[PDB]
């Protein structure tokens, strides 16, 4: 049933064929389950495992490795002679590593997915329905509440569906629906039809929305829509699925992927070309092509990448930064401008009326004032009211009595006592509750409150004013006039002839212009120029002083219009109905900046991040706040870097864009302006973190490259967001950007470490083919390196502790190459030394090791010419070239160097003498475990037969360290030219 908000109780009942006492029949339930599905957000769709395999097949390197599989398969098939046929392990392993990688990408594609699942969290487990089974209410699983059944809800329950209220059983019904509308005040719900069929949800005051909770009361309704049809379920309809564009790192990695394709193909052609001058031969340059493919591809890199991301996500997630979109962590390092709202994010949103003034005397041009101050900054109703630092019984001033009345009446919020926490808490809007607390502190009628209870005391004095003036109706706040008013009539009935009143509170600018009189206690004197000046002179002093107060003016229309001649259907006339007012006084409440923000702001400048503050204060106060928290200097001229929504809109398009180039402070912007500022910032290739919590903030969060939504905010903003501030703190953003920087510098390290490791293997294979030597590494050994003995240090590298200057450098540009020009030189030379060292390791055994045959280099590089007992190969067994020992020398050198390179990769440019190995203790363990797995693979008797290895003696090991360790002295020397001859 659509638009049930416009239909009467009887109509919705007549629509579904239900009784308000009998409920639904099980037969009706079956029929509805069929015609409406269950009451839940359906499981993820559009994702096919088989169709996902196509994406893996489409990737280039997967195509290569898949081709290396079929080759390795046919090679093991054909080569029955001179080897055991139980040697299909290599093609099998190739497939498994390919299968594993497919699983891996899918496995945490669900981590990039379920970002939108943060909305599935808002629906409840259970609900209550009256049904045709029992005369009492049955508690059903919420996902089985079909449309049409009668639902009961009480205090503190979650509304389990979208329900048209049928009959409120308690006195009144208040519904917290902030989660869906942003309404920070519990809405009064009624049972009448709201007439407009397309009215906004804020007007649907007869509807219960799923996912919202009941502030107070108890009602009975009938389910109008379930699951997706609900307004909270309408949020899932977009379901992302927008244009998906590769991240900059994803794009760069793929360019390396194809340069790797070119390089493999060329080497493959070169060795087929070098061999100048058959079945046994067709084997060779296919075997090495497999050895080539396996040696070039990092194999385990996606596993390491998606792991260090997951652990970084949880690191950030415990710093109150909830990463929805995973590509964000890359983007977070490139953040050039954070643009955030003031209230609740730069400040505590913990309101307290700090100062207030009424008029003292008026003589001609002169106008004195009675200024008051109030101790206590919590919502607790405790503290003095001060005049000249001394206590004052507020009720002695008739001007304060009227101020207290206006505050208590121009108010839709209240105070509550949390029985468990033992503290006073905010009900409804924070800025209104500040007035509630102020009234209780003033106590203008000297209501006896001492012997009350912590609960009763919360609203005693507010209730006393409610006992005097009966709030007939309210004139809602509009932004054109920046004020609201309430029409009240006397309720004592014993007291006579007071008359109907209208109490107006609003921004001092507009309210004061619509005043014609100033109340002096109980007397009335017309509004004059000299007095209005002194009023604004203190309002401006307060909103610009060291305490930076938002100010509110309180007024009264002494003679309101005829209640039967006011038309409440159109806001446009509301301002006129608040004319001929009498200025009563002004309250000034503080909302102090969070302890951290001043320092957190400083970091953004040190790191080259511009901070734009969007706020609703006046341009005067907005500028002042920016000096207080440090966006501007106290003595700096900020004329050109602070704008208002109307000022900004006055500039032509060209002058608009130049403003965002330099601006840092926006006051009172329309909703559309956030999205317009982002567009302008994009025109300068600036990468923006933009914050929002409200329902209108959605498009500027989809548009911003890093949409940041508030944890206490609406559901829609969270959905359009890339990240969520669980603690609402602005410093959580800075900490998020900082962490996002460290992670990329660590991804860069293990990317280089793994790929430079790959280079050494490609060199080793290439020399073997070029020199005609026997194979020194076989693909099974390489995969064990590129997946295990390298993967563990590669991961632990991602935990390299951040640089000390990490927040003293400009944002990384999105086009920043993975390697500089010189890094290409450094890693080629190391990958070269790694290639030569592994081949020489095996050659040393064949020619010089005591256990080895001690053959000559001509013999060794013609080892396949050992057809029979040759005169050339005198005293040798042909098989000695297939011996496990030379391979195990090479693999042991490849492993040991990659442990040393891991120690080198601890820093891109720092010596190990300055930043020692134990700086990353997680990395030491990764090396201890990789080496352990190497001794395991040599010593547990199923394993050596597989990988074709044999345990080295003490001599052969000391030869590995003889060979391997200099790679440290090589990189240390290479790191020297960097920090001493390249930058200067
Ligand atoms: C980069 C190049 C890779 C190095 C590979 C070395 C292969 C050949 C080799 O190294 O054979 C030369 C000697 C070996 O020494 P040996 O005593 O085992 O000779 C034989 C012992 N016999 C007399 C009892 C039989 O090694 C030496 O000259 C050189 C010492 C090797 C240390 C590598 C460090 C690189 C700088
Ligand atoms: C190795 C891979 C490195 C580069 C490849 C380029 C081509 C080099 C081929 C050389 C041939 C070869 O090695 O066999 C020649 C001699 C042994 O032959 P034989 O059996 O006739 O002798 C009799 C010995 N009997 C009777 C005991 C068996 O072997 C030797 O002396 C090998 C001694 C190796 C000494 C390593 C010292 C490292 C120090 C600094 C340089 C490092 C950078 C490398 C630069 C590469 C070039 C650009
Ligand atoms: N586009 C705008 N043009 C003009 N003023 C704007 C605009 N947007 C917001 N304001 C005013 O600024 C006040 C608080 O803004 P501020 O807390 O700085 O930031 P926001 O709460 O708007 O943003 P956030 O909640 O953090 O997303 C609001 O209080 C009030 O009017 C609102 C308000 N209200 O929002 O309901 C009621 C009120 N009385 O008296 O009822 C007085 C306000 N006031 O004096 O500012
Ligand atoms: F060895 C397998 F083929 F099985 O696994 C891999 C290992 C590494 C890569 C690489 C790619 N496909 C691979 C597939 C290519 N793009 C896939 C990819 C893109 C971004 C991220 Br993050 C991870 C992988 C480009 C080089 C890196
Ligand atoms: K976005």
Numbering used by the authors: 1 to 277, 288 to 994
Please share excerpts from the published article on this structure:
The fungal H+-ATPase Pma1 belongs to a family of membrane-embedded ATPases that pump ions across cellular membranes, a process energized through transient phosphorylation by ATP. Here we report a compound library screening campaign that identified a series of Pma1 inhibitors that exhibit broad-spectrum antifungal activity. Computer modeling, supported by structural biology indicates that the compounds bind to a groove at the intracellular membrane interface, similar to other P-type ATPase inhibitors that block the ion entry channel. The overall topological organization of all structurally characterized P-type ATPase family members, such as SERCA, the Na+,K+-ATPase, the plant H+-ATPase, the CopA Cu2+-ATPase and the Zn2+-ATPase, is very similar and it is therefore unlikely that the Pma1 structure deviates significantly from its other family members.
To complement the functional data of the tetrahydrocarbazole compounds with structural information, we collected X-ray diffraction data of an inhibitory complex of compound 7 bound to SERCA (rabbit isoform 1a). This complex was formed in a Ca2+-free so-called E2 state and used an ATP analogue, TNPATP, to stabilize the flexible nucleotide-binding region of SERCA, which has been well characterized both functionally and structurally. The 3.0 Å crystal structure of the inhibitory complex shows compound 7 bound at the cytosolic membrane interface, in a groove between transmembrane helices M1, M2, M3 and M4. Despite the modest resolution of 3.0 Å, difference electron density maps clearly allow the placement of bound TNPATP at the ATPase active site, two lipid molecules at the luminal membrane interface (modeled as DOPC), and of compound 7 which is cradled deep inside the cavity marking the cytoplasmic end of the Ca2+ inlet channel of SERCA. However, an anomalous difference map visualizing the isolated signal from the heavy bromine atom in 7 reveals two distinct peaks (5.7 and 7.3 σ) in close vicinity to the tetrahydrocarbazole core. A model with two alternative conformations of the bromo-phenyl moiety, with an occupancy of 0.5 each, allowed a straightforward placement of the bromine atoms into both anomalous peaks. The tetrahydrocarbazole core (modeled with an occupancy of 1) is held in place by three polar contacts to SERCA residues D59 on M1, N101 on M2 and D254 on M3, as well as several hydrophobic interactions involving V62, L65, L98, L253, I307, P312, I315, and the Cβ and Cγ -atoms in the side chain of E309. Interestingly, the SERCA•7•TNPATP complex protein has crystallized in a previously unreported crystal form, reflecting a novel overall conformation of the ATPase. The three cytosolic domains adopt positions roughly halfway in-between the Ca2+-free E2 and the Ca2+-bound E1 state.
